[PDB]
C-alpha cells in the first residue's frame, strides 16, 4: 500500500539516494534467519546492492526481541533499514516504540523525511493496519492485494483515527467493526518475498536467470504450505523462464553452458540424488496414500514396483547408478502405474536449472538441501542464544551454498536433507503407531517425549518438517478431519516444549481456500491468561517455547480457548 509494486523500484532508488555514498556505508539489511524465501530475497537484494557498489551490512535475525535488540545497536550513519520476510503482520513501529517526530528531519514544505527509514517486507498477506498506514518511517511493500483488501479497512481506520453523540457512537462502532473484521483473522501468505524482489527487479529490468531461479526457490519453499499460491506463481515463473531463456537450444555440452529448464518434477524425495525406491519411501504424499507407515503400506509399495515391472533391486539401487534405458522409461512407467495406484498426483512440473557438466538441479531438491543446511548447518537462555547464533551460522552456510561455486556445500545440504527426512519419516511412523496425536475436537494435540530427534525438533525447521509429514498423512486420510494440529517437542537441556501451530490442509489431489491459522492468536491469549511461561520473541508467533511442566496446564487452557 505505502509503496506500490510498481513503486518498489522507486523505493529502491530512494534507498540509493539516502545511503549511496563511497565515503560511508549508510545501509543495513535485516533478514529473519531460517527463512528460505527471505534468504532468497536477501541474496537477490545483496547482489543488486553489490552491483550498485553501496556498502551495507547483513545480520540474520531469529526473533522479534532479537530484532528490537539489534535496532537498539543501530548506527546513525545508516540512513536506511530493510526488513525481509518479517514484521509485516505486526506493527513494527509499535513493537520498537519508534517516534516519527524524533526521526523526522526537514519535515517542513509538505515533505516527510527521516534520519533512518524502515522498509518492511513480509510474505504473509495480513499486515497490521498501523504498520501499513500509521507509521511513515515504516514503508510497507505490497503486491496490491493488501491495498485491494484494505481499501475499506483504511477508510474505516482513518475515519476512526479522525473520530474522537449516539450517531458518532454508531460511526465509531462501524469503524471498529471493520477494523476488528480485518483483525482476528488467521495469518496466511499470499505472495513470496522473493517474488516481490523479482517484481522490483523486473521494474528495474535487472531480472536474470539466476534471480528467476532464486524467486523460483522461494516459491518452491512456499509450495508445501500454500500449493494454491505455488500454482498461481508457477505460470509466471514459466513465462519468465521463457522470456529469459537463451535463443540457443539443444546446445552442445560444455561446463559454461547454463540454462533453466521447465521440466516435469515428480513428487518424490530427491529422486535424482536418492534411489528410486527410497525416493518413493521418503515421500510424504506416497506414505500418506499407501499408508506406508504400516508394513501393509510398504508391501503395497513393493507390489506397485512389481506392477511397474522394474526389479525391486533396480528401484532400490541409487538413481544415478540406475540403468540409462530405465531412466528414460521411468516417465512412461509412472504414467502407467501412478494411475493404477491412484497416485497420479505425484507427477508434477518443476523448474530445473542446469550448468553444463555441473548439470541440472531441481528447485525442490535445492530447497530441501537449503532447509537441511539451515537446520543442521553446525544459563538455558544463554544456551538458546548460542543456538540462535548457530542458526544464524546455518543461515550463512545456506547463503554460501547458494553460490554456484559452493556445490559441495549444496551436496552437504542434500545429504543432511536425506538424514533429516529419514529421521522425520521414522518419527512420523512411530508417532502414527503410538497415536500420540489426539483428536481433541478443538484441535489435534501431540506432545513429544521421545529421546531421538527432540533436539532436532527444538529447531523449528525440523519440528515443522515432522508436522508437515503428519499433516500430509492426515490430509490424504479422508477419515481424519481437517483440524488444527499442535506439535510440542522438548529439549531436555532447556526443559521447555516448543509448541508450533499447524493448520490443516487438503489432500494433494484436492485443490478450496486454505485453513487459516488460529494458533497464533490462541497461543497469545493463552499466554496472557496462563501463568505458564511462553515465548513469543520468535518471528513466528505460532511457534512458542513453554516449560515442560508449563505445557500441560497451557494445553488445557488451549483446549479451553475459543480461538481454536
Amino acid at each position: 500500500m505505502y509503496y506500490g509494486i510498481s513503486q518498489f523500484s522507486e523505493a529502491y532508488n530512494k534507498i540509493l539516494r539516502n545511503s549511496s555514498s563511497h565515503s560511508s556505508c549508510q545501509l543495513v539489511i535485516f533478514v529473519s534467519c531460517l527463512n528460505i524465501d527471505a534468504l532468497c530475497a536477501t541474496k537477490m537484494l545483496s547482489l543488486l546492492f553489490k552491483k550498485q557498489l553501496v556498502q551495507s551490512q547483513i545480520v540474520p535475525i531469529f526473533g522479534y526481541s532479537e530484532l528490537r535488540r539489534h535496532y537498539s545497536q543501530l548506527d546513525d550513519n545508516i540512513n536506511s533499514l530493510l526488513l525481509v520476510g518479517f514484521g509485516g503482520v505486526i506493527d513494527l513501529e509499535a513493537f520498537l516504540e519508534i517516534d516519527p517526530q524524533e526521526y523526522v528531519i526537514d519535515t517542513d514544505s509538505g515533505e516527510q523525511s527521516f534520519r533512518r527509514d524502515i522498509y518492511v517486507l513480509d510474505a504473509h498477506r495480513p499486515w497490521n493496519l498501523d504498520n501499513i498506514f500509521g507509521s511513515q518511517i515504516i514503508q510497507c511493500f505490497d503486491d496490491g492485494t493488501v491495498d485491494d483488501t484494505l481499501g475499506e479497512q483504511k477508510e474505516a481506520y482513518y475515519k476512526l483515527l479522525e473520530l474522537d453523540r449516539k450517531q458518532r457512537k454508531k460511526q465509531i462502532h462501524e469503524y471498529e467493526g471493520v477494523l476488528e473484521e480485518y483483525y482476528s483473522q488467521g495469518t496466511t501468505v499470499v505472495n513470496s518475498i522473493s517474488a516481490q524482489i523479482y517484481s522490483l527487479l523486473s521494474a528495474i529490468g535487472e531480472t536474470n536467470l539466476s534471480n528467476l531461479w532464486l524467486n523460483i526457490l522461494g516459491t518452491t519453499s512456499l509450495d508445501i504450505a500454500y500449493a494454491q499460491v505455488y500454482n498461481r506463481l508457477y505460470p509466471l515463473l514459466q513465462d519468465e523462464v521463457k522470456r529469459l531463456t537463451p535463443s540457443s537450444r539443444n546446445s552442445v555440452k560444455t561446463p559454461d553452458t547454463l540454462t533453466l529448464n521447465i521440466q516435469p518434477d515428480y513428487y518424490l524425495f530427491l529422486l535424482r540424488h536418492s534411489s528410486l525406491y527410497d525416493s518413493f519411501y521418503y515421500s510424504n504424499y506416497v506414505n500418506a496414500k499407501l499408508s506406508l507407515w504400516n508394513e501393509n503400506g510398504k508391501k503395497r509399495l513393493h507390489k506397485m514396483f512389481a506392477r511397474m515391472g522394474i526389479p525391486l533391486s533396480t528401484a532400490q539401487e541409487t538413481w544415478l547408478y540406475m540403468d540409462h534405458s530405465i531412466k528414460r522409461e521411468l516417465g512412461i512407467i509412472f504414467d502407467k502405474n501412478l494411475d493404477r495406484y491412484g497416485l497420479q498426483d505425484i507427477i508434477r512440473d518443476g523448474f530445473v536449472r542446469t550448468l553444463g557438466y555441473r548439470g541440472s538441479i531441481s528447485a525442490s531438491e535445492f530447497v530441501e538441501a537449503l532447509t537441511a543446511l539451515l537446520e543442521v548447518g553446525n544459563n538455558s537462555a544463554q544456551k538458546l542464544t548460542n543456538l540462535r547464533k548457530r542458526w544464524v551460522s546455518n543461515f550463512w552456510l545456506s547463503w554460501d551454498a547458494l553460490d554456484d561455486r559452493k556445490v559441495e556445500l549444496l551436496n552437504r545440504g542434500i545429504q543432511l536433507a536425506q538424514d533429516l527426512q529419514r529421521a522425520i519419516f521414522n518419527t512420523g511412523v512411530a508417532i502414527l503407531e503410538k497415536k500420540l496425536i489426539k483428536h481433541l475436537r478443538i484441535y489435534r494435540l501431540c506432545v513429544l517425549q521421545d529421546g531421538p530427534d527432540l533436539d532436532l525438533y527444538r529447531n523449528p525447521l525440523t519440528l515443522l518438517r515432522l508436522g508437515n509429514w503428519l499433516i500430509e498423512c492426515c490430509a490424504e486420510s479422508e477419515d481424519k478431519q481437517l483440524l488444527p494440529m499442535v506439535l510440542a517437542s522438548i529439549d531436555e537441556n532447556t526443559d521447555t516444549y516448543l509448541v508450533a501451530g499447524l493448520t490443516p490442509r487438503y489432500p494433494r489431489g484436492l485443490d478450496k481456500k486454505p485453513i487459516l491459522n488460529n494458533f497464533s492468536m490462541a497461543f497469545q491469549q493463552i499466554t496472557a491468561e496462563t501463568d505458564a511461561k511462553v515465548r513469543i520473541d520468535n518471528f513466528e508467533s505460532s511457534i512458542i517455547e513453554i516449560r515442560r511442566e508449563d505445557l500441560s496446564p497451557f494445553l488445557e487452557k488451549l483446549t479451553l480457548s475459543g480461538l481454536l
Partner: protein
Amino acid sequence: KFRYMPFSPAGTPFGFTDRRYLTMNEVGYVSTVKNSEQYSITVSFFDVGRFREYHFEDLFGYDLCFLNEKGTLFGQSKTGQIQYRPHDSIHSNWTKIIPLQAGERITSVAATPVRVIVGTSLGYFRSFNQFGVPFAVEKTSPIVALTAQNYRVFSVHYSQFHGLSYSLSELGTSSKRYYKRECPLPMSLPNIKDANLDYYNFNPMGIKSLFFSSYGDPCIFGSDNTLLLLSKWRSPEESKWLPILDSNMEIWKMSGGKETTDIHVWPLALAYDTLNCILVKGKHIWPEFPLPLPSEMEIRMPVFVKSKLLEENKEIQIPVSMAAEEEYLRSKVLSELLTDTLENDGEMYGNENEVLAALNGAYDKALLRLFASACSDQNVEKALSLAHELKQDRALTAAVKISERAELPSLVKKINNIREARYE
C-alpha cells in the same frame, strides 16, 4: 514483382530461430523473443549510463521497431498498431492503430524527438507528434525505409514505376524543410544463396541498414554492401553520393587474397571516419542473437584494383602510389565533409577543427608522395599539377625540396613561381 515488407534498421529475420533482432542501432539493439506466439521484446542500450535496459513481453509482436534516445517506436505493419515508448517513459508509452487499407502495410517507421514518422506500402504517409497527435496525413511513393537522426529525417521511397528514390528532410522543432524529395537513389537491388534468399524475403530491398552518420550526414548500407554516403547534402544542388567504403573489397584485402563467403558486414552506425559494424559470419547474413562487439573500420576508397593487388600478392600488398592516391582522395573527402559539418552543424566536440587541420596535413603528405611518384615518372607537368593541388605552401616547401631531389629544373622553377604566387 517487388514485395512490400516492413523494414527496420539492422533488422534480423527470425528464420530458424524463434528470436530475432527487431532492430539495431548505436542507441541500442532490440531483440524480440517468441514466447508462445507472443514475442517478448527486449530493448538493450549500448550507453549503460544514459539508459537502463527494459524488456517487456509483446503479444502484438510488433514487426517494426525504431529506437531514438527520446523514445522507442514499435509497430505492427499488418494490424497498423504503433506503440511509442519514451526512453525515460515519464510520458506514458502511447499506442495507436493507423488506417490500413486491404493490402496496406507499414513498410518502415522512424522516431523524432517531437514527432513520429509512419510510412505505408501503399505510400500513405502519416505524421504524428511525440504525444501521438497526428500532425499530418499524406500520400507519397512507398517509403521503403525511414531514418531520422533527431530532427533530421532521411527516407527512401520506391515503386515499380517511381523506381529507387529518397527524400531528405530537416524538420527541426519548427520550420519543417525537405532538403530532397524522392531524389533517385543510385543503388542496385539484390538478385533473387538460400540464406541470402531468406534475407531478401525478410528485406526485399536488401538494405542491411539505413542510417544517418554520427555527424548526421545521410548514409546507407545497400545489398551490394558497398557503403554509400551523401556528400555535400547541405547544398541540394551539389549533393552527391560517395561509395566511401567497399565492404567486399575490405573483406578481401583483410583476408589477404582469400575469398570468404561466410563472412559478411552488418553496420549499426557510422562513427566519424570509422564504421561501427558487426561482421556477420556463417551462412546467415544477419547476426546471431548474442551480439559480438561491432568491428570498427575506417573508410577505404574503391580505387584499389583487385587484379593489381593479386599481382602484388603473387596479407595483401598495395603499391605505395596507389596507397597515396587512396589516402589523398579519402582525406579530401573527409576534409570537405568536416568543413561542411563545422560550418553548418558546428562542432559537437572541439577536437574536430584540430582533426581537420591534421587531415589537411595528411592530405598534403599524400599529395607530396604522389608528387614524388610523378617526379619518378619525370613528368614535370604532372608533378606541377600535384604541387598546385597541394593545399599548404608549407607543404609546397617540401614539394620544392622533392623537386630538387628529382633534380628537375623546370619543376623547381615552377615550384618557385608557385611559392611567389602563394605569397601573393
